[PDB]
Amino acid sequence: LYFQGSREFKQKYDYFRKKLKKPADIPNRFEMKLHRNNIFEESYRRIMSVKRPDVLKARLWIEFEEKGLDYGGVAREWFFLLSKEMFNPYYGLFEYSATDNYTLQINPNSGLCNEDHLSYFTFIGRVAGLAVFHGKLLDGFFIRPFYKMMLGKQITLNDMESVDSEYYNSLKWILENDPTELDLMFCIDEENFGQTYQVDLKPNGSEIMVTNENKREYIDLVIQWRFVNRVQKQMNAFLEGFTELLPIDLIKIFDENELELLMCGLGDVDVNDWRQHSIYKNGYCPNHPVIQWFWKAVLLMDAEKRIRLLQFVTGTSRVPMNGFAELYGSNGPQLFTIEQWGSPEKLPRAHTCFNRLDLPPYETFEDLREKLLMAVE
Amino acid sequence: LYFQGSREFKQKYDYFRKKLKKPADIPNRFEMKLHRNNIFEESYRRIMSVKRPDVLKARLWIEFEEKGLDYGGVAREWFFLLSKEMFNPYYGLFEYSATDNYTLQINPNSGLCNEDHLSYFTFIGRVAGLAVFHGKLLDGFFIRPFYKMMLGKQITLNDMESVDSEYYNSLKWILENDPTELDLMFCIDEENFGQTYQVDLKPNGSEIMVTNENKREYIDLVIQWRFVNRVQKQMNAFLEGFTELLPIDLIKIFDENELELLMCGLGDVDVNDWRQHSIYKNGYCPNHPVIQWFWKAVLLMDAEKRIRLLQFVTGTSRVPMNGFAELYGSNGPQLFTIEQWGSPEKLPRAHTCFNRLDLPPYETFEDLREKLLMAVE
Ligand code: NA
Ligand code: NA
């Protein structure tokens, strides 16, 4: 299945769009004149200067540095280029949810990176609200608890699985079995800029043991800590900006899976960029049957498996912001590499520090495809 | 099925590579210093200066205009960028085989575009031979009769189908039925730079009627005319260059389908470039459920269907050389367009002069996918 509940998504989408009003009370165009190389700070100033947010709902008229293009197409570029910045953890406002993940979460230390952080979150919410209002997608994916918080839905243990399987399986184990052999206490490690702090989940938590009686409270507190309690001013600031463009009661017709799709579309890896920036070693080359089989097998995979493949080889499911040319390994720049290795009766292997697939020279297309899918799973 | 006979292709490929010899009689590197903007003429001069073709079989050391990249990756760029020029019909050496096709054939008027045309065909054969020798792919596809001619295989009526269905069906009809009602003669129209010439297929052909007795000769002559007789000096010049790097008896281990794959890989459309340069009209936009369904359905199609889709909407299965940003319609530049149109009980329609898909607002993903595939077929 590819878009479960699509009947209902489109029904909500039609209703939503009818309920959105374009005021006739406003200028014909909202204009922006920007430099690609300075898009984040320039858009912040322009968007945060406006005092009547209804003027933002005018037809977007964005120009970079050129006049002869479609304005919808250019707005779509602006949204894409600016997403790439807003969501770049370099700014300290968002961070990747784990090293192997591409999904973003609010950085709880945002106010330490930037005294005016809440102003920035408001700006970001204004831009997300603007995107939905004008029917554009953002380029980036937030963790599932972010969408839930936008909708005022409670964050749960099941929200942990998509973010951190290992940790979800541990907490699920505790929920389903007597925790006492684990010797856990109501405190957790919090790492802030390379420094670790033991923080109490509850008063004098560090001295309270987790038992069959209190383990559910323990799980709730951890989940609060992990997703909620540290970022409420951020999220509140983000929601103030978002709802300057969209009434929260309209957006709340969507559930959290529908909201992600509406805001962000579907995740995938660009195979053409991938293929153009890969290197072959130990006897492989672009025309080699094994390599041509390889790329066709990659193209035949679903989005999710391609992502799993990328993570299998590189250690992460994220693609550098400037695409595969800028792929990095353990010791600096390292393009994605396929090296002839092993016997055709072995499965492929990876050296993640080198972004390197060790790929045996299989004897047919179908064998390669089957052995590769198995390795990926 | 995706790579039929792949067991045998790889077997031939292994044998082939063992039979290819890298002389120890040569310099360590063959060097090229080039400008991207002048790649065709500069590479011609450098490649055609060499008198001992075995020096070409040295490790390729190509630099543009930058030193810090993989040399194999840069050679792969050179081969790609230069393919794009060699095979650009602007030069008069190759032409597209039909308006709706991307496959290339030798231009029979090459010697009128360029007095030194055979020197250029030799250069091109040297570059193709160099590509195979070093295991690189070319960027472009020749018609099936081109590969056959490289291998000295006879061109037949069945070779017409992949090039021109309509004409193949006509000639097949004649082979299978009494041709007399058609009133055909042994002459054909030949268009040269916008001028039409009646040319005799056989002496005084213009006055000889096609009958049940002579129809097979008629078909053979047409096929000769269409693919063979006009381009033998070209093809001979191309083969002289190719075989300076590869003995013809080695290349002849492959059949014509294997040879294409070896030289050129598989055809496809880059969906990311496609999607980034499409425009939405009459109520559609990037986040619209119908649009997000659309792109996922395109991504799920095989290469062949995507190509058929592109041809359905634009009138041609070819992509501009600089990708979808440079898509052209009937009245100049026209990006690929999806416009909301019709009732969900209709199939999508296209206006090819506008590169425009008329796409009804279907109610589910599965309905859109089914109705789109049907239209495409
Ligand atoms: Na890595
Ligand atoms: Na067209």
Coordinates of C-alpha atoms in Angstrom, one line a residue, chain A residues 13-360:
Chain A
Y13 CA -8.0 18.6 1.7
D14 CA -11.0 19.8 -0.4
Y15 CA -12.9 20.9 2.8
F16 CA -9.8 22.6 4.1
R17 CA -9.3 24.6 0.8
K18 CA -12.9 25.7 0.7
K19 CA -12.6 27.0 4.3
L20 CA -9.4 29.0 3.5
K21 CA -10.2 32.5 2.6
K22 CA -8.2 34.8 0.3
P23 CA -9.1 38.3 1.5
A24 CA -9.9 40.9 -1.2
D25 CA -8.7 43.3 1.5
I26 CA -5.0 43.1 0.5
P27 CA -2.4 44.1 -2.1
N28 CA -2.2 42.1 -5.4
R29 CA 1.2 40.7 -4.7
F30 CA 3.5 40.2 -1.8
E31 CA 7.0 40.9 -3.1
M32 CA 10.4 39.6 -2.1
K33 CA 13.7 40.5 -3.7
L34 CA 16.4 38.1 -2.5
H35 CA 19.9 36.7 -3.0
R36 CA 20.2 32.9 -3.1
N37 CA 23.4 33.1 -1.1
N38 CA 21.6 35.0 1.7
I39 CA 18.1 33.6 1.7
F40 CA 17.6 32.7 5.4
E41 CA 18.5 36.1 6.9
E42 CA 16.9 38.2 4.1
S43 CA 13.6 36.3 4.2
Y44 CA 13.5 36.5 8.0
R45 CA 13.7 40.3 7.8
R46 CA 11.2 40.7 5.0
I47 CA 8.6 38.2 6.5
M48 CA 9.1 39.6 10.1
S49 CA 8.6 43.2 9.0
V50 CA 5.0 42.6 8.1
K51 CA 2.5 43.6 10.8
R52 CA -0.7 42.5 9.0
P53 CA -0.2 38.9 8.2
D54 CA -3.1 38.9 5.7
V55 CA -0.8 40.8 3.3
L56 CA 1.3 37.6 3.1
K57 CA -1.7 35.8 1.6
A58 CA -1.3 37.8 -1.6
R59 CA 0.1 36.2 -4.7
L60 CA 3.8 35.6 -4.0
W61 CA 6.1 37.6 -6.3
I62 CA 9.6 36.4 -5.5
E63 CA 12.7 37.4 -7.5
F64 CA 16.3 36.3 -7.0
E65 CA 19.3 38.6 -7.8
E66 CA 15.9 37.4 -13.3
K67 CA 12.4 38.1 -14.5
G68 CA 11.3 35.5 -17.2
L69 CA 10.0 32.5 -15.1
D70 CA 6.7 31.3 -13.6
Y71 CA 6.1 32.9 -10.3
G72 CA 4.5 29.7 -8.8
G73 CA 7.7 27.8 -9.9
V74 CA 9.9 30.5 -8.3
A75 CA 7.9 30.6 -5.1
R76 CA 8.4 26.8 -5.1
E77 CA 12.2 27.4 -5.5
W78 CA 12.2 29.9 -2.6
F79 CA 10.3 27.5 -0.4
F80 CA 12.8 24.7 -1.3
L81 CA 16.0 26.8 -0.9
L82 CA 14.7 28.4 2.3
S83 CA 13.6 25.0 3.8
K84 CA 17.1 23.8 3.3
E85 CA 18.3 26.7 5.5
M86 CA 15.6 26.9 8.1
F87 CA 16.0 23.2 8.8
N88 CA 19.8 23.2 8.6
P89 CA 21.0 22.4 12.1
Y90 CA 23.9 24.9 11.6
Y91 CA 21.4 27.6 12.8
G92 CA 20.7 25.8 16.0
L93 CA 16.9 25.9 15.6
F94 CA 16.3 22.3 14.5
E95 CA 18.6 19.2 14.8
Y96 CA 18.5 15.7 13.3
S97 CA 16.7 13.4 15.6
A98 CA 19.6 10.7 15.6
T99 CA 22.8 10.2 13.6
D100 CA 21.3 7.6 11.3
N101 CA 18.1 9.7 10.7
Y102 CA 17.1 12.5 8.4
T103 CA 14.0 13.6 10.5
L104 CA 14.3 16.9 12.3
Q105 CA 13.3 17.9 15.8
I106 CA 13.3 21.3 17.7
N107 CA 16.8 21.8 19.2
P108 CA 16.1 22.3 23.1
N109 CA 19.2 24.5 23.2
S110 CA 18.0 26.9 20.5
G111 CA 17.9 29.8 23.0
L112 CA 21.6 29.2 23.7
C113 CA 22.6 29.3 20.0
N114 CA 20.5 32.4 19.4
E115 CA 19.1 34.9 21.9
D116 CA 16.3 35.8 19.4
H117 CA 15.4 32.1 18.8
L118 CA 11.6 32.5 19.4
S119 CA 11.4 35.3 16.8
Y120 CA 13.1 32.8 14.4
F121 CA 10.6 30.0 15.4
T122 CA 7.7 32.4 14.7
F123 CA 9.3 33.3 11.3
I124 CA 9.6 29.5 10.6
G125 CA 5.9 29.0 11.5
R126 CA 5.0 31.9 9.3
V127 CA 6.9 30.2 6.4
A128 CA 5.3 26.8 7.1
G129 CA 1.9 28.4 7.3
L130 CA 2.6 30.3 4.1
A131 CA 3.6 27.0 2.4
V132 CA 0.3 25.3 3.3
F133 CA -1.7 28.4 2.5
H134 CA -0.2 28.6 -1.0
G135 CA -0.1 24.8 -1.5
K136 CA 3.7 24.4 -1.5
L137 CA 5.7 21.6 0.1
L138 CA 8.6 22.1 2.5
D139 CA 11.9 20.3 1.9
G140 CA 12.5 18.4 5.2
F141 CA 10.8 16.0 7.5
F142 CA 10.1 16.4 11.2
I143 CA 9.8 13.6 13.6
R144 CA 6.3 12.3 14.2
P145 CA 6.0 13.9 17.7
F146 CA 6.4 17.3 16.0
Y147 CA 3.2 16.9 13.9
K148 CA 1.4 15.6 17.0
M149 CA 2.4 18.7 19.0
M150 CA 1.2 21.0 16.3
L151 CA -2.2 19.2 16.6
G152 CA -2.2 19.1 20.5
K153 CA -2.1 15.3 20.5
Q154 CA -0.4 13.5 23.4
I155 CA 3.0 11.9 22.6
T156 CA 3.2 8.3 23.4
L157 CA 5.6 5.3 23.5
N158 CA 4.6 4.2 20.1
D159 CA 5.8 7.7 18.8
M160 CA 9.4 6.5 19.9
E161 CA 9.6 3.6 17.5
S162 CA 10.0 5.6 14.2
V163 CA 12.6 7.7 15.9
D164 CA 14.7 5.2 17.9
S165 CA 13.9 1.4 17.6
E166 CA 16.5 0.3 20.1
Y167 CA 15.1 2.6 22.8
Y168 CA 11.5 1.9 21.9
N169 CA 12.2 -1.9 22.2
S170 CA 13.7 -1.3 25.6
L171 CA 10.8 0.8 26.9
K172 CA 8.3 -1.8 25.4
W173 CA 10.2 -4.6 27.2
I174 CA 9.9 -2.7 30.5
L175 CA 6.1 -2.1 29.9
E176 CA 5.6 -5.9 29.3
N177 CA 7.9 -7.4 31.9
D178 CA 9.0 -7.0 35.6
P179 CA 11.6 -4.2 35.3
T180 CA 13.4 -4.8 38.7
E181 CA 16.4 -6.8 37.3
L182 CA 17.2 -3.7 35.2
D183 CA 18.0 -1.5 38.3
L184 CA 16.7 1.7 36.7
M185 CA 16.1 5.0 38.5
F186 CA 13.9 8.0 37.7
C187 CA 16.8 10.0 36.1
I188 CA 18.1 10.3 32.6
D189 CA 21.4 11.6 30.8
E190 CA 21.0 14.8 28.9
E191 CA 23.8 15.9 26.6
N192 CA 24.1 19.6 25.9
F193 CA 26.9 20.7 23.5
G194 CA 29.1 17.7 24.4
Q195 CA 28.4 17.8 28.2
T196 CA 26.3 15.2 30.0
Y197 CA 23.9 16.2 32.8
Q198 CA 22.0 13.7 34.9
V199 CA 18.4 15.1 35.1
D200 CA 15.7 13.9 37.5
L201 CA 12.5 12.8 35.8
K202 CA 10.7 13.5 39.0
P203 CA 11.7 15.0 42.4
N204 CA 14.7 13.2 43.9
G205 CA 14.1 10.9 40.9
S206 CA 17.8 9.8 40.9
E207 CA 17.1 7.7 44.1
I208 CA 13.7 6.2 43.1
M209 CA 13.8 2.8 41.7
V210 CA 11.7 1.7 38.7
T211 CA 9.3 -1.2 39.7
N212 CA 6.1 -2.9 38.4
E213 CA 4.1 -0.3 40.3
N214 CA 5.6 2.8 38.8
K215 CA 7.0 1.8 35.5
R216 CA 4.2 3.4 33.4
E217 CA 5.0 6.8 35.1
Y218 CA 8.6 6.2 34.3
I219 CA 7.9 5.6 30.5
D220 CA 5.6 8.7 30.4
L221 CA 8.3 10.9 32.0
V222 CA 11.0 9.8 29.6
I223 CA 8.7 10.4 26.6
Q224 CA 7.9 13.9 28.0
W225 CA 11.6 14.5 28.4
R226 CA 12.5 13.2 25.1
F227 CA 10.0 15.1 23.0
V228 CA 7.9 17.7 24.9
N229 CA 8.9 19.5 28.0
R230 CA 12.1 21.1 26.7
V231 CA 10.7 22.7 23.5
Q232 CA 7.3 24.1 24.5
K233 CA 8.3 27.8 24.1
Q234 CA 9.8 27.0 20.7
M235 CA 6.8 25.1 19.6
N236 CA 4.5 27.8 21.0
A237 CA 6.4 30.4 19.0
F238 CA 6.3 28.2 15.9
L239 CA 2.5 27.8 16.3
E240 CA 2.0 31.6 16.8
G241 CA 3.6 32.1 13.3
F242 CA 1.8 29.2 11.7
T243 CA -1.6 30.3 12.9
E244 CA -1.1 33.9 11.7
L245 CA -1.8 32.3 8.3
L246 CA -3.9 29.2 9.3
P247 CA -6.5 29.0 12.0
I248 CA -5.5 26.1 14.2
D249 CA -9.1 24.7 14.0
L250 CA -8.7 24.2 10.2
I251 CA -5.4 22.5 10.4
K252 CA -6.8 20.2 13.1
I253 CA -9.1 18.5 10.7
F254 CA -6.0 16.5 9.6
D255 CA -4.4 13.8 11.7
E256 CA -0.6 13.6 12.1
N257 CA 0.1 11.4 9.1
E258 CA -2.1 13.5 6.9
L259 CA -0.4 16.7 8.2
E260 CA 3.1 15.5 7.4
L261 CA 2.0 14.6 3.9
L262 CA 0.3 18.0 3.5
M263 CA 3.4 19.9 4.7
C264 CA 6.2 17.8 3.5
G265 CA 5.2 15.2 0.9
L266 CA 7.1 11.8 0.7
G267 CA 10.7 11.0 1.5
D268 CA 13.0 9.5 -1.2
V269 CA 16.5 9.4 -2.6
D270 CA 17.3 10.8 -6.0
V271 CA 18.9 7.8 -7.8
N272 CA 20.3 9.9 -10.8
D273 CA 22.3 12.2 -8.4
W274 CA 23.3 9.0 -6.5
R275 CA 24.4 7.2 -9.6
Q276 CA 26.3 10.2 -11.1
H277 CA 28.4 10.6 -7.9
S278 CA 29.4 7.0 -7.2
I279 CA 32.8 5.4 -7.7
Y280 CA 33.7 1.9 -8.7
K281 CA 36.7 -0.1 -7.4
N282 CA 38.5 -3.4 -7.8
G283 CA 37.3 -4.1 -11.4
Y284 CA 33.9 -2.5 -11.5
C285 CA 33.0 0.4 -13.8
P286 CA 29.8 2.1 -15.2
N287 CA 29.3 -0.5 -18.1
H288 CA 29.9 -3.6 -15.9
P289 CA 26.9 -5.9 -16.0
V290 CA 26.9 -6.1 -12.1
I291 CA 26.8 -2.3 -11.8
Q292 CA 24.0 -1.8 -14.4
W293 CA 22.1 -4.6 -12.6
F294 CA 22.7 -2.8 -9.3
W295 CA 21.3 0.6 -10.4
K296 CA 18.2 -1.0 -12.0
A297 CA 17.6 -3.0 -8.8
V298 CA 17.9 0.3 -6.8
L299 CA 15.5 2.0 -9.1
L300 CA 13.0 -0.9 -8.7
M301 CA 13.0 -0.6 -4.9
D302 CA 10.4 1.4 -3.0
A303 CA 11.5 4.7 -1.5
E304 CA 11.8 3.1 2.0
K305 CA 14.2 0.4 0.8
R306 CA 16.4 2.9 -1.2
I307 CA 16.6 4.8 2.1
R308 CA 17.5 1.6 4.0
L309 CA 20.1 0.8 1.3
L310 CA 21.7 4.3 1.8
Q311 CA 21.7 3.7 5.5
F312 CA 23.1 0.2 5.1
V313 CA 26.1 1.5 3.1
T314 CA 26.7 5.0 4.7
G315 CA 25.5 4.5 8.2
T316 CA 22.8 7.1 7.7
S317 CA 19.6 7.6 5.8
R318 CA 20.4 11.3 5.2
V319 CA 21.7 12.8 2.0
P320 CA 24.0 15.8 2.2
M321 CA 22.2 19.0 1.6
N322 CA 24.0 19.6 -1.7
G323 CA 23.4 16.0 -2.8
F324 CA 25.7 13.0 -3.3
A325 CA 28.8 15.0 -4.6
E326 CA 29.2 16.1 -1.0
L327 CA 29.0 12.7 0.7
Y328 CA 31.2 12.4 3.7
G329 CA 32.7 9.3 5.5
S330 CA 34.7 8.9 8.7
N331 CA 37.9 10.6 7.4
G332 CA 36.3 13.5 5.4
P333 CA 34.9 13.6 1.9
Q334 CA 34.1 10.1 0.5
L335 CA 31.9 9.4 -2.5
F336 CA 29.6 6.4 -2.4
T337 CA 31.7 3.4 -3.5
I338 CA 30.9 -0.1 -5.0
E339 CA 33.9 -2.4 -4.8
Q340 CA 34.1 -5.8 -6.3
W341 CA 34.5 -8.2 -3.4
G342 CA 33.7 -11.7 -2.3
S343 CA 32.3 -14.8 -3.9
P344 CA 28.9 -14.8 -5.7
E345 CA 27.6 -17.1 -2.8
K346 CA 28.0 -14.3 -0.3
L347 CA 25.7 -11.4 0.5
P348 CA 26.9 -7.9 0.0
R349 CA 28.6 -6.1 2.9
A350 CA 29.3 -2.5 3.8
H351 CA 32.1 -0.5 5.3
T352 CA 30.1 2.5 6.6
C353 CA 33.1 4.7 7.5
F354 CA 34.0 4.5 3.8
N355 CA 30.5 4.7 2.3
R356 CA 31.5 1.5 0.5
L357 CA 29.4 -1.3 -0.7
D358 CA 31.3 -4.6 -1.0
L359 CA 29.4 -6.2 -3.9
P360 CA 30.1 -9.8 -5.1

